[PDB]
Design a protein around this nucleic acid. Structure first.
Ligand code: NA
Ligand code: NA
Lengths: 144, 148
DNA sequence: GGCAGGGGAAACACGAAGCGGG
DNA sequence: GGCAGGGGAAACACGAAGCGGG
């Protein structure tokens, strides 16, 4: 019998690492107001805040789900992987909730009716803003 | 592993799907579901490879929107529904190479969005009869192909 | 649950190597 | 492509036993 039973932080930490790896295996296999961390949210060392930041992470991740749904009908060569980023994020959003809709429908169909040049631009910068957001989340969480 | 013919891939592709349905169906009237009839030509008499073949494709194209409806009907088996759905996508392609009637890409949604507005018993019934038809349909397709 | 939680892991100027059905 | 194609198989009245990443 082999697996060490983990605490909340370890579990959450491992999950983000799981997601960052996945995303990167989509970065290799490849108007916009995407969530970027701010100092007022209290996730950086300057003006740090364990309460305010956790709210920004859960709020943020939740706002990324639609843009993750977007990425699904975008990777016709890496389908299951792009799904595994979608579900792992959901999974992540549930680990961060222990510790503590048609606007989407419309803005999906806007992104999804742009030309390929625009759609691959959207893809590119979604993935990079997801990476930004996760890395700095892993960092903040490596404290509280 | 050893290699197989195009016909012996189709036969396995169906068998694979039929076992992924038996698994689904274990956990979980006014509709219009694809149903083999004498007119199709998939039976020992009144038989015809061409028409039978066409209807096997056609009927499987018709089923797709209903399998998409299945995804949410197995929240506690999301991948089993998905395998079944995408393993059917493949089957169609295989069949299409061995070769049509494709329903509108805008009428299938009105049905899908409506189905989802039924109370939880009608969904339960709708689910049990999607599987039943689809199984019987694939049961007949297999037998027919094991002849032509 | 169970064999067990909720189908399946140090070096480059700091940005490739290497543990599981119903 | 490669190691190969296009991420991963008898016995009950006819309806359980048990094979591989980029
Ligand atoms: Na398990
Ligand atoms: Na389980």
């Amino acid at each position: 019998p082999h697996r060490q039973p983990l605490t909340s932080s370890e579990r959450i930490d491992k999950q983000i690492r799981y997601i960052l790896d996945g995303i990167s295996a989509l970065r290799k296999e490849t108007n916009l107001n995407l969530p970027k961390m701010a100092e007022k949210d209290g996730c950086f060392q300057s003006g740090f805040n364990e309460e305010t930041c956790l709210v920004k992470i859960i709020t943020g991740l939740l706002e990324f789900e639609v843009y993750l749904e977007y990425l699904q009908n975008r990777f016709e060569s890496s389908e299951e992987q792009a799904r595994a980023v979608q579900m792992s994020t959901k999974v992540l959003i549930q680990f961060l909730q222990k510790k503590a809709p048609t606007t989407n429908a419309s803005l999906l169909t806007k992104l999804q009716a742009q030309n390929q040049w625009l759609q691959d631009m959207t893809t590119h910068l979604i993935l990079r803003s997801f990476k930004e957001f996760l890395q700095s989340s892993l960092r903040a969480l490596r404290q509280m």
